[PDB]
Amino acid sequence: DPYATSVGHLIEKATFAGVQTEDWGQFMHICDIINTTQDGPKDAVKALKKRISKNYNHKEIQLTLSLIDMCVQNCGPSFQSLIVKKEFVKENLVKLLNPRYNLPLDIQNRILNFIKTWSQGFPGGVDVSEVKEVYLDLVKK
């Protein structure tokens, strides 16, 4: 279970349906944990993947994306490499752009924006070949 792991639980709570705003103090604490534990990055992405997947909640997705954008720029490629994997962007993030989830243009453009930004590559390893194509498709159609 994703929300079971130490850092997994902090994520479940930081993006809980209840909260109506971003607890940036908490998100930071989350990143620091991601950077301390041995498998924090992997375990974190499993929880984020959960929270995101086929979710119809506005704020949960809004908060989760904000939480993602945080880790992306506060944790090395050890994290960035798992978020740009096709298993995440194509089978989770981009799914939300489907009409079925009727999410607002606000959140929609934010999704495209991550794709476009992550497609720009990050410093160091991180292979963005996949998300690079996931972006191109959103542009073509």
Side-chain angles (χ1 to χ4, degrees):
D1 178 301
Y3 301 172
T5 51
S6 310
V7 76
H9 187 77
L10 296 184
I11 294 178
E12 168 190 49
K13 170 169 292 57
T15 59
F16 205 84
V19 205
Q20 194 259 183
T21 178
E22 284 81 353
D23 180 5
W24 308 96
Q26 234 322 94
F27 287 178
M28 189 49 97
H29 176 61
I30 281 180
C31 289
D32 297 325
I33 299 294
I34 304 298
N35 287 146
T36 51
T37 317
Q38 245 285 213
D39 240 46
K42 195 186 173 191
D43 297 349
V45 183
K46 292 177 192 294
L48 292 170
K49 188 176 174 187
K50 183 165 192 165
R51 177 61 68 195
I52 285 287
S53 195
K54 295 185 258 57
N55 196 166
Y56 287 84
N57 193 134
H58 262 40
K59 237 67 167 197
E60 281 181 357
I61 289 174
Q62 183 205 78
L63 291 176
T64 298
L65 297 182
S66 276
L67 172 56
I68 290 178
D69 181 58
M70 272 263 116
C71 304
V72 173
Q73 57 183 297
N74 274 82
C75 313
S78 30
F79 182 78
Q80 326 184 64
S81 287
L82 301 179
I83 227 62
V84 295
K85 283 213 185 305
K86 197 198 314 173
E87 311 160 281
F88 190 82
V89 283
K90 196 185 179 188
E91 321 294 341
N92 283 286
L93 258 180
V94 183
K95 231 78 178 72
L96 295 178
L97 296 176
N98 191 96
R100 187 183 315 102
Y101 304 86
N102 246 300
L103 29 42
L105 239 74
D106 290 294
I107 308 303
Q108 284 209 311
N109 288 321
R110 206 180 173 197
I111 303 295
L112 296 166
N113 284 178
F114 283 3
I115 308 297
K116 173 169 178 179
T117 294
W118 298 347
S119 175
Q120 305 281 55
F122 299 112
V126 54
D127 179 298
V128 300
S129 306
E130 286 174 346
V131 73
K132 221 303 177 185
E133 186 61 20
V134 186
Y135 170 57
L136 235 280
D137 285 350
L138 295 174
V139 173
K140 295 211 192 80
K141 63 186 179 189

PDB file of all heavy atoms in Angstrom, residues 10-32:
ATOM      1  N   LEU A  10       2.715  10.949   4.727  1.00  0.00           N
ATOM      2  CA  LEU A  10       2.805  12.406   4.752  1.00  0.00           C
ATOM      3  C   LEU A  10       2.200  12.989   3.500  1.00  0.00           C
ATOM      4  O   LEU A  10       1.656  14.085   3.521  1.00  0.00           O
ATOM      5  CB  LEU A  10       4.256  12.860   4.868  1.00  0.00           C
ATOM      6  CG  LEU A  10       4.967  12.456   6.154  1.00  0.00           C
ATOM      7  CD1 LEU A  10       6.355  13.062   6.155  1.00  0.00           C
ATOM      8  CD2 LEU A  10       4.179  12.932   7.357  1.00  0.00           C
ATOM      9  N   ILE A  11       2.297  12.245   2.408  1.00  0.00           N
ATOM     10  CA  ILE A  11       1.741  12.703   1.157  1.00  0.00           C
ATOM     11  C   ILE A  11       0.226  12.549   1.168  1.00  0.00           C
ATOM     12  O   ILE A  11      -0.495  13.461   0.766  1.00  0.00           O
ATOM     13  CB  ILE A  11       2.344  11.937  -0.018  1.00  0.00           C
ATOM     14  CG1 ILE A  11       3.826  12.277  -0.119  1.00  0.00           C
ATOM     15  CG2 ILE A  11       1.627  12.294  -1.305  1.00  0.00           C
ATOM     16  CD1 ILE A  11       4.547  11.551  -1.212  1.00  0.00           C
ATOM     17  N   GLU A  12      -0.267  11.404   1.632  1.00  0.00           N
ATOM     18  CA  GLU A  12      -1.713  11.189   1.686  1.00  0.00           C
ATOM     19  C   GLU A  12      -2.392  12.302   2.466  1.00  0.00           C
ATOM     20  O   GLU A  12      -3.461  12.775   2.089  1.00  0.00           O
ATOM     21  CB  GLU A  12      -2.053   9.851   2.351  1.00  0.00           C
ATOM     22  CG  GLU A  12      -3.548   9.707   2.686  1.00  0.00           C
ATOM     23  CD  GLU A  12      -3.855   8.499   3.555  1.00  0.00           C
ATOM     24  OE1 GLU A  12      -3.163   8.312   4.587  1.00  0.00           O
ATOM     25  OE2 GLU A  12      -4.800   7.743   3.225  1.00  0.00           O
ATOM     26  N   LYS A  13      -1.766  12.713   3.562  1.00  0.00           N
ATOM     27  CA  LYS A  13      -2.318  13.764   4.403  1.00  0.00           C
ATOM     28  C   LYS A  13      -2.135  15.172   3.846  1.00  0.00           C
ATOM     29  O   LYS A  13      -3.009  16.009   4.018  1.00  0.00           O
ATOM     30  CB  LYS A  13      -1.700  13.675   5.795  1.00  0.00           C
ATOM     31  CG  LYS A  13      -2.019  14.858   6.702  1.00  0.00           C
ATOM     32  CD  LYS A  13      -1.591  14.585   8.150  1.00  0.00           C
ATOM     33  CE  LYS A  13      -2.448  13.474   8.802  1.00  0.00           C
ATOM     34  NZ  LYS A  13      -2.449  12.155   8.065  1.00  0.00           N
ATOM     35  N   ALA A  14      -1.007  15.430   3.185  1.00  0.00           N
ATOM     36  CA  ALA A  14      -0.732  16.753   2.639  1.00  0.00           C
ATOM     37  C   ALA A  14      -1.603  17.086   1.448  1.00  0.00           C
ATOM     38  O   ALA A  14      -1.718  18.244   1.061  1.00  0.00           O
ATOM     39  CB  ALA A  14       0.724  16.871   2.256  1.00  0.00           C
ATOM     40  N   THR A  15      -2.209  16.071   0.853  1.00  0.00           N
ATOM     41  CA  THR A  15      -3.071  16.296  -0.294  1.00  0.00           C
ATOM     42  C   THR A  15      -4.440  15.737   0.025  1.00  0.00           C
ATOM     43  O   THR A  15      -5.198  15.411  -0.883  1.00  0.00           O
ATOM     44  CB  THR A  15      -2.514  15.604  -1.570  1.00  0.00           C
ATOM     45  OG1 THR A  15      -2.392  14.199  -1.336  1.00  0.00           O
ATOM     46  CG2 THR A  15      -1.148  16.167  -1.943  1.00  0.00           C
ATOM     47  N   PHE A  16      -4.748  15.618   1.318  1.00  0.00           N
ATOM     48  CA  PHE A  16      -6.037  15.083   1.757  1.00  0.00           C
ATOM     49  C   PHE A  16      -7.177  15.944   1.247  1.00  0.00           C
ATOM     50  O   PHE A  16      -7.052  17.164   1.135  1.00  0.00           O
ATOM     51  CB  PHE A  16      -6.120  15.018   3.283  1.00  0.00           C
ATOM     52  CG  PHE A  16      -7.096  13.989   3.797  1.00  0.00           C
ATOM     53  CD1 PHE A  16      -6.709  12.651   3.929  1.00  0.00           C
ATOM     54  CD2 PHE A  16      -8.392  14.348   4.156  1.00  0.00           C
ATOM     55  CE1 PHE A  16      -7.597  11.679   4.416  1.00  0.00           C
ATOM     56  CE2 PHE A  16      -9.289  13.385   4.645  1.00  0.00           C
ATOM     57  CZ  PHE A  16      -8.888  12.043   4.776  1.00  0.00           C
ATOM     58  N   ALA A  17      -8.295  15.295   0.948  1.00  0.00           N
ATOM     59  CA  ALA A  17      -9.474  15.979   0.445  1.00  0.00           C
ATOM     60  C   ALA A  17      -9.820  17.202   1.288  1.00  0.00           C
ATOM     61  O   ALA A  17     -10.203  18.245   0.759  1.00  0.00           O
ATOM     62  CB  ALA A  17     -10.657  15.017   0.423  1.00  0.00           C
ATOM     63  N   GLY A  18      -9.687  17.066   2.603  1.00  0.00           N
ATOM     64  CA  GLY A  18     -10.005  18.160   3.506  1.00  0.00           C
ATOM     65  C   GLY A  18      -9.323  19.488   3.215  1.00  0.00           C
ATOM     66  O   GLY A  18      -9.981  20.461   2.833  1.00  0.00           O
ATOM     67  N   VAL A  19      -8.006  19.527   3.406  1.00  0.00           N
ATOM     68  CA  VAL A  19      -7.228  20.739   3.184  1.00  0.00           C
ATOM     69  C   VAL A  19      -7.704  21.464   1.936  1.00  0.00           C
ATOM     70  O   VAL A  19      -7.977  20.835   0.920  1.00  0.00           O
ATOM     71  CB  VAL A  19      -5.741  20.428   3.009  1.00  0.00           C
ATOM     72  CG1 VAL A  19      -4.928  21.646   3.389  1.00  0.00           C
ATOM     73  CG2 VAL A  19      -5.351  19.217   3.840  1.00  0.00           C
ATOM     74  N   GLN A  20      -7.816  22.785   2.007  1.00  0.00           N
ATOM     75  CA  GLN A  20      -8.268  23.529   0.844  1.00  0.00           C
ATOM     76  C   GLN A  20      -7.125  24.336   0.234  1.00  0.00           C
ATOM     77  O   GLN A  20      -7.266  24.908  -0.846  1.00  0.00           O
ATOM     78  CB  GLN A  20      -9.440  24.443   1.226  1.00  0.00           C
ATOM     79  CG  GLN A  20     -10.214  25.022   0.032  1.00  0.00           C
ATOM     80  CD  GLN A  20      -9.841  26.477  -0.284  1.00  0.00           C
ATOM     81  OE1 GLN A  20     -10.419  27.110  -1.184  1.00  0.00           O
ATOM     82  NE2 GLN A  20      -8.876  27.014   0.461  1.00  0.00           N
ATOM     83  N   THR A  21      -5.982  24.356   0.914  1.00  0.00           N
ATOM     84  CA  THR A  21      -4.810  25.102   0.444  1.00  0.00           C
ATOM     85  C   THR A  21      -3.505  24.298   0.536  1.00  0.00           C
ATOM     86  O   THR A  21      -3.453  23.250   1.176  1.00  0.00           O
ATOM     87  CB  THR A  21      -4.621  26.374   1.273  1.00  0.00           C
ATOM     88  OG1 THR A  21      -3.442  27.058   0.835  1.00  0.00           O
ATOM     89  CG2 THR A  21      -4.482  26.016   2.758  1.00  0.00           C
ATOM     90  N   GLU A  22      -2.448  24.796  -0.098  1.00  0.00           N
ATOM     91  CA  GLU A  22      -1.163  24.117  -0.052  1.00  0.00           C
ATOM     92  C   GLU A  22      -0.448  24.413   1.257  1.00  0.00           C
ATOM     93  O   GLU A  22      -0.314  25.568   1.657  1.00  0.00           O
ATOM     94  CB  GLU A  22      -0.251  24.561  -1.201  1.00  0.00           C
ATOM     95  CG  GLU A  22      -0.582  23.990  -2.573  1.00  0.00           C
ATOM     96  CD  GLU A  22      -1.711  24.721  -3.263  1.00  0.00           C
ATOM     97  OE1 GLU A  22      -2.326  25.601  -2.624  1.00  0.00           O
ATOM     98  OE2 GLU A  22      -1.986  24.416  -4.446  1.00  0.00           O
ATOM     99  N   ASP A  23       0.000  23.372   1.941  1.00  0.00           N
ATOM    100  CA  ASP A  23       0.741  23.578   3.174  1.00  0.00           C
ATOM    101  C   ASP A  23       2.199  23.493   2.753  1.00  0.00           C
ATOM    102  O   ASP A  23       2.829  22.443   2.856  1.00  0.00           O
ATOM    103  CB  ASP A  23       0.417  22.479   4.189  1.00  0.00           C
ATOM    104  CG  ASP A  23       1.179  22.644   5.500  1.00  0.00           C
ATOM    105  OD1 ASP A  23       1.895  23.663   5.661  1.00  0.00           O
ATOM    106  OD2 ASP A  23       1.059  21.752   6.373  1.00  0.00           O
ATOM    107  N   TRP A  24       2.735  24.602   2.269  1.00  0.00           N
ATOM    108  CA  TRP A  24       4.112  24.615   1.818  1.00  0.00           C
ATOM    109  C   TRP A  24       5.126  24.240   2.875  1.00  0.00           C
ATOM    110  O   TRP A  24       6.222  23.803   2.543  1.00  0.00           O
ATOM    111  CB  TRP A  24       4.456  25.977   1.262  1.00  0.00           C
ATOM    112  CG  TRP A  24       3.497  26.393   0.275  1.00  0.00           C
ATOM    113  CD1 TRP A  24       2.435  27.190   0.475  1.00  0.00           C
ATOM    114  CD2 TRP A  24       3.498  26.042  -1.110  1.00  0.00           C
ATOM    115  NE1 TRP A  24       1.749  27.365  -0.704  1.00  0.00           N
ATOM    116  CE2 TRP A  24       2.379  26.654  -1.698  1.00  0.00           C
ATOM    117  CE3 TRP A  24       4.319  25.230  -1.908  1.00  0.00           C
ATOM    118  CZ2 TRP A  24       2.081  26.537  -3.055  1.00  0.00           C
ATOM    119  CZ3 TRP A  24       4.018  25.106  -3.265  1.00  0.00           C
ATOM    120  CH2 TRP A  24       2.899  25.745  -3.815  1.00  0.00           C
ATOM    121  N   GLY A  25       4.778  24.425   4.142  1.00  0.00           N
ATOM    122  CA  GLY A  25       5.708  24.072   5.196  1.00  0.00           C
ATOM    123  C   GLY A  25       5.830  22.566   5.201  1.00  0.00           C
ATOM    124  O   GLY A  25       6.921  22.019   5.339  1.00  0.00           O
ATOM    125  N   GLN A  26       4.685  21.910   5.015  1.00  0.00           N
ATOM    126  CA  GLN A  26       4.580  20.458   4.994  1.00  0.00           C
ATOM    127  C   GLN A  26       5.208  19.861   3.756  1.00  0.00           C
ATOM    128  O   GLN A  26       5.864  18.823   3.835  1.00  0.00           O
ATOM    129  CB  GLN A  26       3.118  20.031   5.054  1.00  0.00           C
ATOM    130  CG  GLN A  26       2.818  19.058   6.155  1.00  0.00           C
ATOM    131  CD  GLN A  26       3.922  18.045   6.351  1.00  0.00           C
ATOM    132  OE1 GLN A  26       4.809  18.239   7.186  1.00  0.00           O
ATOM    133  NE2 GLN A  26       3.892  16.967   5.564  1.00  0.00           N
ATOM    134  N   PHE A  27       4.977  20.490   2.607  1.00  0.00           N
ATOM    135  CA  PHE A  27       5.562  19.996   1.364  1.00  0.00           C
ATOM    136  C   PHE A  27       7.074  19.994   1.484  1.00  0.00           C
ATOM    137  O   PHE A  27       7.732  19.058   1.042  1.00  0.00           O
ATOM    138  CB  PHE A  27       5.163  20.861   0.171  1.00  0.00           C
ATOM    139  CG  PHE A  27       3.746  20.679  -0.260  1.00  0.00           C
ATOM    140  CD1 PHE A  27       3.226  21.434  -1.294  1.00  0.00           C
ATOM    141  CD2 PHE A  27       2.919  19.770   0.389  1.00  0.00           C
ATOM    142  CE1 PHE A  27       1.907  21.282  -1.674  1.00  0.00           C
ATOM    143  CE2 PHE A  27       1.600  19.613   0.014  1.00  0.00           C
ATOM    144  CZ  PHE A  27       1.093  20.372  -1.013  1.00  0.00           C
ATOM    145  N   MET A  28       7.623  21.046   2.080  1.00  0.00           N
ATOM    146  CA  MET A  28       9.059  21.126   2.250  1.00  0.00           C
ATOM    147  C   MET A  28       9.495  19.972   3.130  1.00  0.00           C
ATOM    148  O   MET A  28      10.435  19.246   2.805  1.00  0.00           O
ATOM    149  CB  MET A  28       9.468  22.455   2.888  1.00  0.00           C
ATOM    150  CG  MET A  28      10.985  22.693   2.905  1.00  0.00           C
ATOM    151  SD  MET A  28      11.866  22.386   1.161  1.00  0.00           S
ATOM    152  CE  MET A  28      11.984  24.195   0.441  1.00  0.00           C
ATOM    153  N   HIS A  29       8.808  19.784   4.244  1.00  0.00           N
ATOM    154  CA  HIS A  29       9.181  18.694   5.118  1.00  0.00           C
ATOM    155  C   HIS A  29       9.153  17.385   4.345  1.00  0.00           C
ATOM    156  O   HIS A  29       9.976  16.510   4.579  1.00  0.00           O
ATOM    157  CB  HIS A  29       8.248  18.604   6.321  1.00  0.00           C
ATOM    158  CG  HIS A  29       8.538  17.429   7.199  1.00  0.00           C
ATOM    159  ND1 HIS A  29       9.750  17.259   7.832  1.00  0.00           N
ATOM    160  CD2 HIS A  29       7.811  16.321   7.467  1.00  0.00           C
ATOM    161  CE1 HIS A  29       9.757  16.091   8.449  1.00  0.00           C
ATOM    162  NE2 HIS A  29       8.594  15.501   8.243  1.00  0.00           N
ATOM    163  N   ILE A  30       8.208  17.254   3.420  1.00  0.00           N
ATOM    164  CA  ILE A  30       8.102  16.040   2.625  1.00  0.00           C
ATOM    165  C   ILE A  30       9.322  15.841   1.743  1.00  0.00           C
ATOM    166  O   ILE A  30       9.842  14.735   1.647  1.00  0.00           O
ATOM    167  CB  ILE A  30       6.847  16.059   1.737  1.00  0.00           C
ATOM    168  CG1 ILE A  30       5.614  15.693   2.577  1.00  0.00           C
ATOM    169  CG2 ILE A  30       7.018  15.113   0.571  1.00  0.00           C
ATOM    170  CD1 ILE A  30       4.316  15.672   1.799  1.00  0.00           C
ATOM    171  N   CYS A  31       9.780  16.909   1.093  1.00  0.00           N
ATOM    172  CA  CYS A  31      10.952  16.827   0.211  1.00  0.00           C
ATOM    173  C   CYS A  31      12.205  16.427   0.964  1.00  0.00           C
ATOM    174  O   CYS A  31      13.000  15.620   0.486  1.00  0.00           O
ATOM    175  CB  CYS A  31      11.204  18.168  -0.462  1.00  0.00           C
ATOM    176  SG  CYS A  31       9.982  18.569  -1.699  1.00  0.00           S
ATOM    177  N   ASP A  32      12.377  17.022   2.138  1.00  0.00           N
ATOM    178  CA  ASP A  32      13.524  16.726   2.972  1.00  0.00           C
ATOM    179  C   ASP A  32      13.566  15.237   3.320  1.00  0.00           C
ATOM    180  O   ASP A  32      14.637  14.634   3.356  1.00  0.00           O
ATOM    181  CB  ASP A  32      13.481  17.559   4.254  1.00  0.00           C
ATOM    182  CG  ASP A  32      13.568  19.052   3.989  1.00  0.00           C
ATOM    183  OD1 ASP A  32      14.282  19.466   3.044  1.00  0.00           O
ATOM    184  OD2 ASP A  32      12.934  19.820   4.748  1.00  0.00           O
TER     185      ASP A  32
END
